[PDB]
């Protein structure tokens, strides 16, 4: 089956280089052309550019002339998009694309899900994990302060809680970043049985289960 | 280099409605391409070819234009449409896409479950208090949460996120977050969160006391 697998997430320092990868697999590498596509986060689709791996064809969109760099291995079906000379513009999701050679009647059928570089000199941070209990269904909660690299992981009960939980989207305070999560369940469950949120900041391999007790 | 416009970015719709988004273009176009793209998903190939329609997609979509204004149309709504629908060009260079429209499910308004919470043992420990106040399961999206502290408006030092829109009953939620020092919160008694909804005809306040 068709798929193409990037890069994980990036966090560079200002100036320095970046090299993000597509890998292909599952058809002919010589018979598809690669085109990379950015999405700062929030805002809409951009082009950079396509790369057609036999011809070593490059075409950038003449925008990211200077920016990006186009290469490719063909051993392991791989293509390369280097960026260079980073600042806090070039933060965004990059994604890759793939589109048949000599078709027009054609698209982008297949991509290759997203990898968020992060441009900034902000030193990786560990998160603070609090619990948050209250004081017929009962809302819980932990919260996730003072992490920088993002992102992190909220499960409860090692995923044994799924229905019934709203993880919110992280926020910059000053600059480090605030998540809150929320379960609920029934007052029949809770305290009688343990609830404990798990979190992992996989940037600095921490992995944290906080037990919620009810407060004196 | 062609610069795509697109229709109402924010656009409700209920099931079984019509919907229909449209892409403007700066310069004459041959051909145009839409996407959807889900909550921090890839963008998947939606239509292609102007109207072909392209792999995976049910017969309710229909794409058209032919011109310098183009448009994709859904004729009969259903939940799992939820989702920003981009418009590319491949005629000119470089390739060029729209701004993007936000579709979203339109249900009956829901109110929200508030609920308050005082800050933890170990964040007072570590010498911190945060106040957090979740908002669950509402419609619609729009919402102001207000702080009081002593009955009175905190201005500053707040913090609001919101989830998108939920999968199964299409409605959203909420955290508000209140951060302060752990000697200014052991120094006031009561904290309220109070919110303004268009259901209610009053605000939904939660509080609570230090002294408990």
């Known amino acids: 089956k068709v798929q193409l697998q990037q890069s994980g997430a990036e966090l560079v320092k200002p100036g320095a280089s970046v090299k993000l990868s597509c890998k292909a697999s599952g058809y002919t590498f010589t018979e598809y052309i690669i085109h990379w596509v950015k999405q700062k986060s929030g805002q809409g689709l951009e082009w950079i550019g396509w790369?057609?791996?036999?011809?070593?064809?490059?075409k950038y969109n003449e925008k990211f002339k200077d920016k990006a760099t186009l290469t490719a291995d063909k051993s392991s079906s791989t293509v390369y998009m280097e960026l260079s000379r980073l600042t806090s513009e070039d933060s965004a999701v990059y994604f890759c694309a793939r589109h048949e050679d000599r078709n027009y009647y054609s698209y982008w059928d297949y991509w290759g899900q997203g990898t968020t570089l992060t441009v900034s000199s902000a030193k990786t941070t560990p998160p603070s994990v609090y619990p948050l209990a209250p004081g017929s269904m009962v809302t819980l909660g932990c919260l996730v302060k003072g992490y920088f690299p993002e992102p992190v992981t909220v499960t409860w009960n090692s995923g044994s809680l799924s229905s019934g939980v709203h993880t919110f989207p992280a926020v910059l305070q000053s600059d480090l970043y605030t998540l809150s999560s929320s379960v609920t369940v029934p007052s029949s469950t809770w305290p009688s049985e343990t609830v404990t949120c798990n979190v992992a900041h996989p940037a600095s391999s921490t992995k944290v289960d906080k037990k919620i007790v009810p407060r004196d | 280099q062609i610069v795509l416009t697109q229709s109402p970015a924010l656009m409700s719709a209920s099931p079984g409605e019509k919907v229909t988004m449209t892409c403007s273009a700066s310069?004459?176009?041959?051909?145009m391409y839409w996407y959807q793209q889900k909550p921090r998903s890839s963008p998947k190939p939606w239509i292609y070819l102007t109207s072909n329609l392209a792999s995976g997609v049910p017969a309710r979509f229909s794409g058209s234009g032919s011109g310098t204004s183009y448009s994709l149309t859904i004729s009969s709504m259903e939940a799992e449409d939820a989702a920003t629908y981009y418009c590319?060009?491949?005629?000119?260079?470089?390739?060029?896409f729209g701004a993007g429209t936000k579709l979203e499910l339109k249900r009956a308004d829901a109110a929200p479950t508030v609920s308050i919470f005082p800050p933890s043992s170990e964040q007072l420990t570590s010498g911190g208090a945060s106040v957090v106040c979740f908002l669950n399961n509402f419609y619609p999206k729009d919402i102001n949460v207000k702080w009081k502290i002593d009955g009175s408006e905190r201005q500053n030092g707040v913090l609001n996120s919101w989830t998108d829109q939920d999968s199964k009953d299409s409605t959203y939620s909420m955290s508000s977050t209140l951060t302060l020092t752990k000697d200014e919160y052991e120094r006031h008694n009561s904290y309220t969160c109070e919110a303004t909804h268009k259901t209610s005809t009053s605000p939904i306040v939660k509080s609570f006391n230090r002294n408990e």
């Open positions: 590319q060009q491949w005629s000119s260079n470089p390739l060029t």
């Open positions: 310069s004459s176009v041959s051909n």
């Open positions: 790369f057609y791996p036999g011809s070593g064809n490059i």
